[PDB]
């Protein structure tokens, strides 16, 4: 039975959110560290009983859902709400096999035809990440949307939007101290808002940064990685040093 971390939006604070994301990181990692950045477990040869962690979310209305995250990339692969569980379309038959080990006692299992990458979820949501507000309120609402989906109360664009919210506030926050800090600001002020390009370009570039760092020459990138600032202006990262405060977890490479 996989490790569970619990979080509630009801009365959430910057401290309780911080404690939550720190705990999620602690279960994702163990660690293996390259140029000072922790590396997630290699998917190859990883035993199945170590492959996943569970995040149980609930809100003031006492609605609860449990997300499953893949420890190899910290990303959401599916969720359970009561008698039903739903999984993104797996990319290969090894991953398809792996998720049969999740929520094994649930009476109804479903695998969506679509995967959980942003390109696809944005389409289904009818909005880009740039136009989807994040915050404690949005998380509170996403929990409910996920909860009501099996009984037909949640439209598909709402569900997609709710995934996009959960994935950013949990997976991307775990991956990036920077994104964790951005979510803290919204919680602090109880003020929702959409992510700006500084957040969006880090998300889009997580795999490329993981590669750049692990393949670097003493921390120096073989080729620079371009990101955007809040105002859209472009800049390059040439070295791991400037990312030490920014990126917290890397997908395994070599």
């Amino acid at each position, epitope marked *: 039975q996989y490790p569970i971390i619990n979080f509630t939006t009801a009365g959430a604070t910057v401290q309780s959110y911080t404690n939550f994301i720190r705990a999620v990181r602690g279960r994702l990692t163990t660690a293996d560290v390259r140029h000072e950045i922790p590396v997630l477990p290699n998917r190859v040869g990883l035993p199945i009983n170590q492959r996943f962690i569970l995040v149980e979310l609930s809100n*003031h209305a006492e609605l609860s859902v449990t997300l499953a995250l893949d420890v190899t990339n910290a990303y959401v692969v599916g969720y359970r709400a009561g008698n039903s569980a739903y999984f993104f379309h797996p990319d290969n038959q090894e991953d398809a096999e792996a998720i049969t080990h999740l929520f094994t006692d649930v009476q109804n299992r479903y695998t969506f035809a679509f995967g959980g990458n942003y390109d696809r979820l944005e389409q289904l949501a009818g909005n880009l990440r740039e136009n989807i507000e994040l915050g404690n*309120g949005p998380l509170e609402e996403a929990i*409910s949307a996920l909860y009501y989906y099996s009984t037909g*109360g949640t439209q598909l664009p*709402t569900l997609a939007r709710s995934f996009i919210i959960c994935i950013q506030m949990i997976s991307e926050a775990a991956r990036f101290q920077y994104i964790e800090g951005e979510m803290r600001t919204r919680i602090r002020y109880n003020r929702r808002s959409a992510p700006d390009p500084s957040v969006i370009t880090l998300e889009n570039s997580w795999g490329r940064l993981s590669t750049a760092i692990q393949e670097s020459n003493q921390g120096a990138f073989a080729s620079p990685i371009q990101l955007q600032r809040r105002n859209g202006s472009k800049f390059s990262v040439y070295d791991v040093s400037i990312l030490i405060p920014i990126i917290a977890l890397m997908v395994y490479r070599c």
Partner: nanobody, 129 residues
Framework: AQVQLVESGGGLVQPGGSLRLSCVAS???????????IGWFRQAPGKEREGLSS?????????SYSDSVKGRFTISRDNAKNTVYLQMNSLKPEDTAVYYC?????????????????WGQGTQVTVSS
């Protein structure tokens, strides 16, 4: 016993007038109305139901308004009276319709009738002289 929503406040009004609709939740349902999202809808004989204004269950008080009513309508809460209000100012004849409230426990600010669970009985609003 499920929550029951009782509406009031509709009626005849002339152009430029206002009404205030109330959505009053029944006593002795478990959760109080501040735990719910509440959406307002209207529906005219030919037309399908139409979302106009909604307030989330979220604690940041998030509200949504359709372009037809922004700046004129205001949705608000009176928790002491287990009530949500819809203040409708600057009414014009094509606001004429039956108006409905709807609620969902832990809900979000939706314009889709499918994303609520409980409905008020409806109340007619007519604007003309």
């Amino acid at each position: 016993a499920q929550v029951q929503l009782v509406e009031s406040g509709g009626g005849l009004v002339q152009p430029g007038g206002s009404l205030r609709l109330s959505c009053v939740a029944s006593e002795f349902s478990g959760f109080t109305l501040d735990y719910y999202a509440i959406g307002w809808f209207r529906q005219a004989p030919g037309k399908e139901r139409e979302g106009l204004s909604s307030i989330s269950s979220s604690s940041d008080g998030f509200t949504s308004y359709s372009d037809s009513v922004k700046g004129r309508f205001t949705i608000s809460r009176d928790n002491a009276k287990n009530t949500v209000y819809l203040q409708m100012n600057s009414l014009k004849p094509e606001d004429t319709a039956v108006y409905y409230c709807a609620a969902r426990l832990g809900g979000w600010a939706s314009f889709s009738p499918q994303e609520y669970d409980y409905w008020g009985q409806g109340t007619q609003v007519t604007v003309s002289s």
